[PDB]
Swiss-Prot record:
It catalyses: deoxyamidinoproclavaminate + 2-oxoglutarate + O2 = amidinoproclavaminate + succinate + CO2; proclavaminate + 2-oxoglutarate + O2 = dihydroclavaminate + succinate + CO2 + H2O; dihydroclavaminate + 2-oxoglutarate + O2 = clavaminate + succinate + CO2 + H2O. Pathway: Antibiotic biosynthesis; clavulanate biosynthesis; clavulanate from D-glyceraldehyde 3-phosphate and L-arginine: step 3/8; Antibiotic biosynthesis; clavulanate biosynthesis; clavulanate from D-glyceraldehyde 3-phosphate and L-arginine: step 5/8; Antibiotic biosynthesis; clavulanate biosynthesis; clavulanate from D-glyceraldehyde 3-phosphate and L-arginine: step 6/8. It comes from Streptomyces clavuligerus. This is Clavaminate synthase 1. The gene is cs1. 2-oxoglutarate binds at R292. Binds 1 Fe(2+) ion per subunit. The lineage of its organism: Bacteria, Bacillati, Actinomycetota, Actinomycetes, Kitasatosporales.
Amino acid sequence: TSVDCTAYGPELRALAARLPRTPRADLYAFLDAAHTAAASLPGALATALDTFNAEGSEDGHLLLRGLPVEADADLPTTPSSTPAPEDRSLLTMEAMLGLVGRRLGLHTGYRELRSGTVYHDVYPSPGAHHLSSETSETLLEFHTEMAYHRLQPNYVMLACSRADHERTAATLVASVRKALPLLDERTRARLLDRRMPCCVDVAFRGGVDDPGAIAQVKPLYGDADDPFLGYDRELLAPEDPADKEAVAALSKALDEVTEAVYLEPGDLLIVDNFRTTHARTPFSPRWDGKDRWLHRVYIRTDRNGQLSGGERAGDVVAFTPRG
Ligand SMILES: O=C(O)CCC(=O)C(=O)O
Ligand SMILES: [Fe+2]
């Protein structure tokens, strides 16, 4: 689903100007300011966000286009490293992630990931691991983000400050609401609520005492007629023949309903991380200081088990595997 936000530029530049200029120095206060300001989002944008939050969509994403972004010459050099400096001045697309994110829920960091920070720069780096956001020339395969984590976030949000030079990197999304009807009833029933072994991403590795301790992911779960999805092409590891066959049918169906989005400066993509898998196609970095640059945050909501009380936007949570 898409919303053209161009006509909102003046109002959104104003809301961004309400926010602290050095977000990370007091991230709790920054995100509280963003929550207050989110009450003043333009009405039709607020409606689109609240509708998507409550209901999702058939295509599993909400793309906001034409948000105020700095001119390319007015941005810093694309980052080369992580974590970001705590003193880094606010970027307009970060302000947008604050406002839009707090309209939806609570920004969440993961202790073991990206030094326990909340805002993540997504840029290409040489020598990237094949599952990393740092990849460029190799396809980043379909994944639900952190499907294996008990505190998996409801949304992944990606805001673009720079696209890659040739605008060849496409962000791919595949929605369970489009894939499910392509599956037959026997496949749906095998997948639904069935725990399967799932490896974890690099950041979360170690301390796995025995095969008992391996994370368990239900590739479909919840209401049989409108299930949630948990899928990771590389990390999900079904063991019985009937499980491998059912996951292969799911994989095929997700490919057949793939949608491609080319993120450009000013775009903010909201992925329904309980109903959709995402991926990124190849591109060739130039190592020139102007490579592709996204900002990523994770948002928790009241849906399903994410929150148990007292959480704040900006909290950083520890790892517990699903079981
Ligand atoms: O680079 C992209 O478009 C998406 C990368 C991604 O999967 C993520 O940052 O979670
Ligand atoms: Fe991702």
